[PDB]
Ligand binder design. Structure first.
Ligand SMILES: [Mg+2]
Ligand SMILES: [Mg+2]
Ligand SMILES: [Mg+2]
Ligand SMILES: [Mg+2]
Ligand SMILES: [Mg+2]
Ligand SMILES: [Mg+2]
Ligand SMILES: [Mg+2]
Ligand SMILES: [Mg+2]
Ligand SMILES: [Mg+2]
Ligand SMILES: [Mg+2]
Ligand SMILES: [Mg+2]
Ligand SMILES: [Mg+2]
Ligand SMILES: [Mg+2]
Ligand SMILES: [Mg+2]
Ligand SMILES: [Mg+2]
Ligand SMILES: [Mg+2]
Ligand SMILES: [Mg+2]
Ligand SMILES: [Mg+2]
Ligand SMILES: [Mg+2]
Ligand SMILES: [Mg+2]
Ligand SMILES: [Mg+2]
Ligand SMILES: [Mg+2]
Ligand SMILES: [Mg+2]
Ligand SMILES: [Mg+2]
Ligand SMILES: [Mg+2]
Ligand SMILES: [Mg+2]
Ligand SMILES: [Mg+2]
Ligand SMILES: [Mg+2]
Ligand SMILES: [Mg+2]
Ligand SMILES: [Mg+2]
Ligand SMILES: [Mg+2]
Ligand SMILES: [Mg+2]
Ligand SMILES: [Mg+2]
Ligand SMILES: [Mg+2]
Ligand SMILES: [Mg+2]
Ligand SMILES: [Mg+2]
Ligand SMILES: [Mg+2]
Ligand SMILES: [Mg+2]
Ligand SMILES: [Mg+2]
Ligand SMILES: [Mg+2]
Ligand SMILES: [Mg+2]
Ligand SMILES: [Mg+2]
Ligand SMILES: [Mg+2]
Ligand SMILES: [Mg+2]
Ligand SMILES: [Mg+2]
Ligand SMILES: [Mg+2]
Ligand SMILES: [Mg+2]
Ligand SMILES: [Mg+2]
Lengths: 46, 57, 112, 237, 146, 98
RNA sequence: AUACUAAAAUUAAUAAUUAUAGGUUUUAUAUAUUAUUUAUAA
RNA sequence: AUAUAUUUAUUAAUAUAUUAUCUAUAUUAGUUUAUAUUUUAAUUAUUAUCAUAGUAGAU
RNA sequence: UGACUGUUCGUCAAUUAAAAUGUUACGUGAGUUGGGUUAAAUACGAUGUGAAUCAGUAUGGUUCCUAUCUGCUGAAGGAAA
RNA sequence: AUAAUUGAGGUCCCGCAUGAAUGACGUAAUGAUACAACAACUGUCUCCCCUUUAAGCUAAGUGAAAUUGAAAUCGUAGUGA
RNA sequence: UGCUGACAUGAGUAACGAAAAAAAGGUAUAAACCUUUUCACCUAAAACAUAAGGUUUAACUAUAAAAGUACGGCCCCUAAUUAAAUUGAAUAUAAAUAUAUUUAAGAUGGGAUAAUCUAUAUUAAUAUUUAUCUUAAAAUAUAUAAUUAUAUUAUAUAUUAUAUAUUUAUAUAAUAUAAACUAAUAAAGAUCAGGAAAAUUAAUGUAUACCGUAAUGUAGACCGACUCAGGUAUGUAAGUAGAGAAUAUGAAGGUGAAUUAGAUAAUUAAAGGGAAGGAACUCGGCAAAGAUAGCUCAUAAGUUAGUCAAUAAAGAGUAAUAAGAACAAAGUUGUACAACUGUUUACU
């Protein structure tokens, strides 16, 4: 069937699995949070 | 013809200027699921009741 | 089904400006309006003369505007407190500027 | 099915409805502006409708009139503003053309519209009433308005009338009474001269209109050979 | 489906005239009732008082102060910290709310100007800032005193 | 021009960046403002930043109210009274004789 | 006659001759009731 | 029912024009229908649109 | 011209005066079809310890193009007549 | 079985190279599976014809693509990476 | 087939993306915007309310109004599940960390009061899914307390007249169409045996927090590169007719489109009809054509006994005897493979 519509939005899932606390509350999540910060990125997380 | 002063296609959107951009902006009250609750630091008074109400302290 | 070599300046020009059919023709069928007095196309009608007569019809067979009795009896103060001013959007504001995308016909030159 | 009439790039149902709407709108108003192709077809159906009414008015066979009255109804939408159309047609439109053998409508070409270069033409009913019960100019009779304006133009410019203006006036005068033609021309004169901000002298205009109509109604056929031909009719030896 | 073999359904039962309950309503609306033009509400029926508290949101009952009416900058100066030190708590309290009241008036004028006219005169904004300076100077004096 | 921005401070980072443009690239913006203003509120003097705007009266060598003699201009040798500061181009607005 | 072209017919309104398309009239075709009948008077 | 002329005495009637053939309650909760109740809430004639050109017979 | 076969071929039936032999990229897929042939799936016989394989068998199974030049079919304009 | 059948069904068996849970054999029903036969039906065909709509064509507005060493870009025979 | 920028050719060519429009006036500025009328399309939707989503795109800056009584979130409670959290020494492990127990979080779920409108706080004491069958009786029609047939099996609130505390409530008795449909107990068939968690009185008390609310939401306002014929959850979805949410019309609503106007060449696509043949076509009946009820009867061989076969083919009853909407409805047989319903190669 037709494809391309893989991203079906949902604020709950988007925030729960890519949000700031979804990464600030884990070792691996924190590591990528600080890596983006060191690179100088404005938007640390979702 | 949504805009009578634009007879031909010039790339103009149906509304707004750009269809894309940043999505990592902080959440606000008007947007989210029906179970979302942002708040406006405008209520620190009282205690929610067990049934689902409020009691002003 | 694709061009095998870039078409040179010569071939392109003689293909488009070469034949007599592709080039537009002089307008020789112009006459003098019996009424307007100005130029007009043959076997046609003078748009200005037609336009002004249509104007005469419009002003002599126009329907009176419906102005309800209630409104004209309101003072300026009651109109303001009851029908306040409102702001228009970009689309609405642009639509009212009809002189930027609508333009009237041009009066034809006079023939002697 | 091929060659009977224009298809107008529409199906049979859509095409038929368009023509009926156009003919009915031509009746409700007096002159309408539309594309040349639409105007010609609307002219055809409109003329046939009037002829049916004339035959119904004139006929003495009850069956003939009964079925004609029905056929006219089939080619109209009697709703909205045209609810009273049939009575209007039988009382006003039909009696205007009782003595005219065809040609109840005329199509005059206008300049194409700039948007798409679509040819445009005006469809109007011949012999439309210039005046009204309210003594005010109403819609219709575009040709008559233009003809009078040309007469005004010649008068204001101090030049003789062109043979074509006189010929067109002659065509208008054939089916119209002398007094009625004089009265309507005078009314158009007053309205136009007012619009162009020109002096309007009642007595002078009356004399000029009398002079014009006398020329129109005069019977002077022999005008000799205008041009000395380079060819001569010689009997065959 | 409605085939050609279908037969009309029997008519619904009808209650005999001798058993039909009379309706609880016999009379109804009036059939001589005509449509009248709407009647607008009129302010001539009102008595909006001249002492109405909302008038404190305006300056001398004016829609928007003009240049001449606004206090000029040369003639004015915000309080100084030493000056506030010679003031009692009640007086400083009184000054605070007087500052706030005019702050509301100026805010109303700024918003009207910057949301309708769009001008960047910001004369009202500067006046509000000067009041804001005094307000925090009052706050500093109280803390130092305590 | 209804934006409700004056009532809040949203986009602090973007506003700071726009208002703290690199000094090397000011000529980029100076051209923009100049080409987009009428001639009757534009001066041919460069602007001054808050850090380059004189505040002390010492730097303001001539406070308004004292006669001055104008050099280097079409009004050479004129005598005039400075009437007001400018606070944007860091200049003096002179009277009719100027 | 024809994709657009091109070809061909008419553009008469006068001292006399000329119908290109639409409309109108006549005749005819088609459709389908009609002698139990259509128009008239005596 | 409204409006304009005439008759009669602003009532009633004739002529003309325009408008409409509604609505509301009861039959045990909701919807549809039916009947009774309230009002003035009509029958005929000829059309029209949709259903593959709705479909068949002709042409 | 038919029946059989993916078939060109070939056998057969009924006709004709005859049902000739070749070349044209065993003419012709930017003209059509695609039954055989081959790729992914599957099974049978044989080979191999197997993974898999077959001058084997069987069912199923994706192509596209708006024509610049040459050439050709029709129709025009310019021209030196 | 057809006018005629390399296809289908029944039967015979030097089974190149079947065979019993890599199950053997015969059924009823089921199957958008594959092959074959009969009745009706038809534009599949003999043999194509007429009609309707959207394109194709013309006029107005907007306006891509693969491709492109440079081109002043004919036929035949011969020659030649 | 070098990287980046600018500009050419294809070329003013293909295309402008399911489509009905017309006149008059705003406006001697309109095919494209607004209004009026006519016509048409969608109408168990292209309508009305919503959920999620989203550059607020809305009828807009003077802008989306909640104590609760069908108003949701918020709050109490938990499921699946999650947790740098808790347990000389909980257990294990090169680190990271994993495991078990607690605690906390987590809706897609549960949470008394209510138009005769209602009161949530503090203190003290003690329910998987599924049907309403048969008999009976009342009442009715033909017949004679017996018999045949028949709507009904239970509630939903109005009127009249009586008895109780005294015109507020209850009770009694009588009257009052049919077809669907709704929530509540009732009764009962099968195995596939059908969630978790958070008390009553007595007194006192309630000045009612915060957030959501526009419009689009079978789409020009979300996911699809596009104002993309694709994907997207829920409830009504007028009537007429029907077994039906099928099919036909359409009351009301919405709507008729960033392409228009002419002739419709050859040719292409989607449809209608076609004489005489009727598979001769073709690898191959691919495609197309073919329906003599849709209700009630009747219905063979074989067979695993299952109207499996079977909606059997042919056939009959109901006006049809020349036809006249749409939808449902498209034969029989032999063989190979597999018991059957199902799953598979998103995109050969
Ligand atoms: Mg993507
Ligand atoms: Mg997940
Ligand atoms: Mg939302
Ligand atoms: Mg139709
Ligand atoms: Mg017709
Ligand atoms: Mg002439
Ligand atoms: Mg002729
Ligand atoms: Mg003649
Ligand atoms: Mg003619
Ligand atoms: Mg319809
Ligand atoms: Mg070959
Ligand atoms: Mg060959
Ligand atoms: Mg094997
Ligand atoms: Mg297959
Ligand atoms: Mg054989
Ligand atoms: Mg065969
Ligand atoms: Mg065999
Ligand atoms: Mg074995
Ligand atoms: Mg079997
Ligand atoms: Mg073009
Ligand atoms: Mg290079
Ligand atoms: Mg081309
Ligand atoms: Mg082309
Ligand atoms: Mg095109
Ligand atoms: Mg207009
Ligand atoms: Mg349906
Ligand atoms: Mg319905
Ligand atoms: Mg909606
Ligand atoms: Mg919890
Ligand atoms: Mg929930
Ligand atoms: Mg909403
Ligand atoms: Mg809403
Ligand atoms: Mg879409
Ligand atoms: Mg999007
Ligand atoms: Mg409707
Ligand atoms: Mg809508
Ligand atoms: Mg479109
Ligand atoms: Mg045939
Ligand atoms: Mg036949
Ligand atoms: Mg064959
Ligand atoms: Mg053959
Ligand atoms: Mg088939
Ligand atoms: Mg048997
Ligand atoms: Mg079917
Ligand atoms: Mg066998
Ligand atoms: Mg199977
Ligand atoms: Mg299956
Ligand atoms: Mg597949």
């Amino acid at each position: 069937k037709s494809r391309g519509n893989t991203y079906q939005p949902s604020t709950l899932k988007r925030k729960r699995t890519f949000g700031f606390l979804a990464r600030a509350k884990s070792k691996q999540g924190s590591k990528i949070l600080k890596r983006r910060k060191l690179k100088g990125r404005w938007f640390l997380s979702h | 013809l949504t805009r009578p002063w634009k007879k031909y296609r010039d790339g103009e959107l149906f509304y707004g200027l750009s269809k894309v951009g940043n999505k990592r902006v902080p959440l606000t009250t008007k947007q989210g699921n029906k179970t979302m609750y942002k708040g406006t630091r405008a209520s620190g008074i009282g205690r929610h009741t067990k049934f689902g109400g409020y009691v002003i302290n | 089904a694709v061009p095998k070599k870039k078409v040179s300046h010569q071939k392109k020009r003689q293909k488009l400006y070469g034949p007599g059919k592709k080039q537009l023709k002089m307008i020789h069928h112009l006459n003098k309006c019996p009424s307007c007095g100005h130029y007009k196309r043959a076997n046609t009608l003078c748009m200005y003369c037609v336009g002004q007569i249509s104007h005469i019809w419009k002003t002599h067979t126009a329907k009176e505007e419906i102005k309800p009795r209630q409104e004209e009896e309101l003072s300026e103060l009651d109109q303001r407190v009851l029908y306040p001013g409102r702001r228009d959007t970009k689309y609405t504001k642009d639509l009212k500027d009809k002189d930027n995308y609508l333009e009237r016909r041009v009066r034809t030159l006079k023939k002697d | 099915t091929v060659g009977i009439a224009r298809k107008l790039s529409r199906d049979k149902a859509h095409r038929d409805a368009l023509l009926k709407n156009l003919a009915c709108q031509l009746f409700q108003h007096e002159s309408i502006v539309s594309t040349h192709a639409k105007c010609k077809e609307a002219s055809r159906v409109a003329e046939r409708i009037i002829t049916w009414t004339k035959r119904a008015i004139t006929t003495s066979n009850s069956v003939a009139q009964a079925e004609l009255k029905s056929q006219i109804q089939s080619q109209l939408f009697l709703a909205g503003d045209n609810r009273k159309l049939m009575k209007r047609l039988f009382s006003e439109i039909a009696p205007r053309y009782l003595e005219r053998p065809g040609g109840y409508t005329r199509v005059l070409r206008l300049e194409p519209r700039a948007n798409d270069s679509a040819p445009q033409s005006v469809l109007e009913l011949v012999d439309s009433p210039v005046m009204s019960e309210s003594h005010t100019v109403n819609r219709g009779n575009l040709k008559m308005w233009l003809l009078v304006k040309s007469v005004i133009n010649d008068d204001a410019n101090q030049l003789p009338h062109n043979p074509l203006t006189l010929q067109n006036l002659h065509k208008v005068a054939k089916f119209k009474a002398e007094a009625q033609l004089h009265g309507e021309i005078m009314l158009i004169k007053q309205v136009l001269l007012k619009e162009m901000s020109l002096p309007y002298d009642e007595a002078l205009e009356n004399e000029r209109t009398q002079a014009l109509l006398k020329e129109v109604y005069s019977s002077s056929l022999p005008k000799k050979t205008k041009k000395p031909s380079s060819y001569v009719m010689v009997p065959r030896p | 489906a409605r085939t050609k073999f279908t037969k009309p359904k029997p008519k619904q039962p009808v209650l005999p005239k001798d058993k039909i309950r009379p309706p609880t309503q016999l009379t109804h609306h009036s059939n001589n009732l005509r449509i009248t033009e709407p009647i607008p509400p009129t302010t001539s029926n009102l008595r909006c008082p001249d002492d109405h508290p909302l008038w404190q949101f305006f300056s001398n009952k004016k829609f928007i102060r003009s240049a001449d009416d606004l206090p000029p900058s040369s003639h004015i100066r915000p309080w100084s910290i030493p000056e506030l030190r010679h003031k009692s708590f009640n007086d400083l309290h009184s000054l605070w709310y007087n500052c706030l009241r005019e702050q509301n008036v100026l805010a109303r004028e700024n918003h009207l100007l910057k949301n309708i006219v769009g001008s960047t005169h910001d004369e009202f904004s500067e006046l509000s800032n000067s009041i804001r300076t005094t307000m925090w100077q009052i706050r500093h004096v109280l803390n130092e005193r305590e | 021009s209804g934006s409700y921005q004056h009532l809040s401070n949203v986009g602090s980072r973007v506003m700071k960046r726009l208002g703290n443009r690199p000094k090397n690239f000011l000529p980029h913006s100076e051209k923009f403002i100049k080409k987009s203003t009428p001639e009757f509120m534009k001066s041919d003097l460069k602007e001054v930043d808050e850090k380059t705007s004189f505040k002390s009266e010492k730097e303001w060598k001539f406070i308004p109210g004292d006669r001055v003699v104008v050099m280097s201009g079409a009004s050479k040798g004129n005598i005039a009274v400075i009437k007001s500061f400018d606070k944007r181009t860091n200049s003096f607005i002179l009277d009719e004789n100027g």
